[PDB]
Design a protein around this ligand. Structure first.
Ligand SMILES: [Cl-]
Lengths: 461, 465
């Protein structure tokens, strides 16, 4: 490891057109000093591999403001208006990549694995290709995504994804020792850790340099072999994107709450599912940005920029919580270790296809495709029954882009609960009291079985 | 996590024929109490996925003695004569699996990845098929391995490997908290960590159970989500397989000059490791160990000996300041990714274009390849062979084509013997660059099984000071 005092000296040899991996999830664990140094060098035409686009004026957004980025590879690019303008104008190329795929592709690039198979994205636009990566200024398509190859293993379909490597990685960490060993704080680890292993030249900024021996050797998150250049960051702003401090929907929330079992591991999406946790039993909440054991929103003095949920909100953790990297988080999710994934949806098909990431009128799929990728995890959709004008949301075939094929196991609406089977279809198992089966029939765009043991829809006390 | 007070209760439902992942590297980080519990249940016809099989009379070796294992999936037999015997005799099935492949296939099994590509094993019996899985009584092959698919990426050839999962995993860890989070000590982590993630039911034995809060949340090695059953081990013997307590010299003193300041190196048993003793205090070289250590130091004094800290040769070792520990999947990610600068190792044969044979002699040496196929798998890592020039009877070790099974094709960059140093080009062959003083080129021609170029700048063989 070579130590630098001046962040610019550490990045001055990045050539124009370089591929650069940039750590962070939202504004959590972003290499703000190294980004600042690139603003000074003015290096341009970059391909940035970055999970998100920061915000307009921070993180990766700063490099968009200066027009130093040509292309991005990312999983979710919302909350950045500059990004949107450039992309729509044909000034920016963008490959939206499932978050778990992004993490594993980066890992593969550090591990000597050129390609691997994953369930994530099978049956979606990721597999099919053809999505706009770049527009022209007149609104025509300049560059479209390529398909992914499909192969069956053990009776299930998977797609082939290839390793990502960079010329450089810009990584944020918490502490380094004088040998160059590095550690990460709370949920700021995320993509920083795997990105440390996947570039020709890795540049790490830390908040503090400590004596050799300050770490237990077992608790070094990134060994020095991966840390080519190290700089102590001059300034840390501790910016917080979303400061979070402590009837149709309530009906859904109060039924969704009854899906929780004692000892359960769950991942809860933004909105109704997370609100359902307030009504919970020991239930361990997982966060795809690398947390197990999420707790309630903080009191003001518990607020910490290094600890957010997947919705980018400030959060807390409970006793016996753990933190881990984005590649590890999605290994946990893709391997079916989470018992229950609960999420919102725009549409669900008769056999359990899910559309919940794109409305043709673009932000990216985030971790949604990974979350529904394993048959071992129960996937429960919580949504209002029908859209505007009693337009069907549950129907024969989705009309909106798929998150996953045949992946939903249960649907909870304000009117009904359905069990879903890939081969057998839908079964109505609960019915909001007062409603009839014919009411459900009129608000549902496909047939369903009615359970002999049908009951009024349950509500958490 | 479900907690148990009796190890047998934790494992009573393993059925005959089950596939069981078993933690450990030699005798380091082995689940000795869970192995004891299986001795009591008598479960049989197992397929045991484990790097090694302990020693004859400890670790997984105990389950070979009791004939409870049908097939081993392993990287190296090591110093277990009974393992070696049962395999050669046709009593035991063994899939000799490159150690980094083993580790990655297990990781894949926990991570939702059914298959992936690796260069490890390309151009060898692993890729080609024909690795003996079961022998006949007469030494012919009853069951041969099947070929692995080959695919080219980025101008290099790779092979397809498939995920490994178990019905059960038997894992040794150091501490668990009352929530079921688990940590590992020193180099006892090895395969235990990825095996935790890759079975239908994971059973972890620990030395201590501690309060929730005993761990920093950043420093939990295996989060509780992976730990289905937890027991505190009743007995820990802290056994040590190999107590190492603090012309060949010519090879060692030349090999010592391969070291550069700042270098990361992986040094094989024997000559390469002995060369590290001649590294100047003015130079910084960091030694990596494939069982999950970075920063190996000298052999320990008695009071420094620790059963949780051994090198790849299974010798008790120490570490230097600023060392780190990591799992076997991470260790081989480090190696296959080309992060190590120098791999130095011995060989039985090397071809003129850099093919290496160092793992098998049909009907004689059948212990496995360990991590050697992985260690020579990256074009970013320099590979130096250190070996005696000729074999018994002046039989050639350097030749046009190896006669023994390959560890790797066109992977060696330099050969150091007591007589010569050769640079190796995969297209142009060998160039004699140094010659031991007193020897002539004809001396080399007589003791070498192929032709070679002689450098215009040939110098006498150098020796470290
Ligand atoms: Cl070994």
């Amino acid at each position: 490891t070579k130590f630098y005092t001046d962040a610019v000296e550490a990045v001055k040899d990045i050539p124009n057109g370089a591929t650069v991996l940039v750590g962070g999830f939202g504004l959590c664990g972003i290499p703000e000093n190294l980004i600042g140094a690139l603003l000074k060098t003015g290096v341009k035409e970059l391909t940035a591999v970055s999970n998100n686009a920061g915000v307009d004026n921070f993180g990766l957004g700063l490099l968009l403001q200066s027009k130093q980025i040509k292309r991005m590879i990312s999983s979710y690019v919302g909350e950045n208006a500059e990004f949107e303008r450039q992309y729509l104008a044909g000034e920016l190329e963008v490959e939206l990549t499932p978050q778990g795929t992004l993490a594993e592709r980066i890992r593969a690039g550090g591990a000597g694995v050129p390609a691997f198979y994953t369930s994530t994205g099978y049956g979606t636009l990721v597999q099919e290709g053809g999505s706009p990566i770049k527009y022209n200024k007149d609104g025509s398509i300049a560059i479209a995504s390529k398909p992914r190859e499909v192969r069956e293993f053990n009776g299930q379909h998977f797609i082939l994804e290839e390793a990502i490597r960079g010329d450089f990685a810009l990584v944020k960490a918490w502490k380094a020792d004088q040998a160059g060993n590095v550690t990460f704080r709370k949920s700021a680890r995320n993509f920083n850790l795997p990105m440390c292993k996947a570039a020709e030249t890795t540049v790490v900024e830390v908040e503090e340099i400590v004596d050799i021996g300050s770490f237990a050797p077992e608790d070094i998150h990134i060994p020095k072999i991966y840390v080519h250049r190290l700089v102590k960051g001059e300034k840390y702003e501790k910016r917080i994107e979303r400061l979070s401090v402590r009837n149709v929907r309530e009906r859904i929330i109060k039924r969704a709450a009854l899906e929780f079992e004692d000892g359960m591991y769950a991942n809860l999406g933004i909105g109704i599912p997370l609100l359902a946790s307030n009504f919970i039993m020991t239930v361990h909440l997982q966060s795809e940005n690398g947390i197990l054991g999420l707790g309630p929103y903080p009191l003001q003095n518990e607020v910490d920029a290094d600890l957010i949920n997947a919705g980018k909100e400030t959060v807390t953790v409970l006793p016996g919580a753990s933190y881990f990297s984005s590649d590890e988080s999605f290994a946990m999710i893709r391997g079916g270790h989470v018992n229950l994934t609960m999420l919102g949806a725009m549409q669900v098909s008769k056999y359990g296809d899910l559309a919940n990431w794109m409305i043709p009128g673009v932000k990216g799929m985030g971790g949604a495709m990974d979350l529904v990728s394993s048959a071992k995890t129960k996937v429960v959709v919580t949504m209002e029954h029908s859209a505007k004008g009693n337009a069907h949301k549950i129907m024969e075939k989705c009309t909106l882009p798929l998150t996953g094929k045949q992946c939903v196991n249960r649907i909870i609406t304000e009117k009904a609960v359905f069990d879903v089977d890939r081969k057998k279809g839908l079964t109505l198992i609960e019915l909001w009291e007062g409603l009839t089966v014919d009411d459900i029939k009129k608000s549902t765009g496909c047939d369903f079985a009615v359970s002999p043991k049908l009951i009024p829809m349950q509500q958490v006390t």
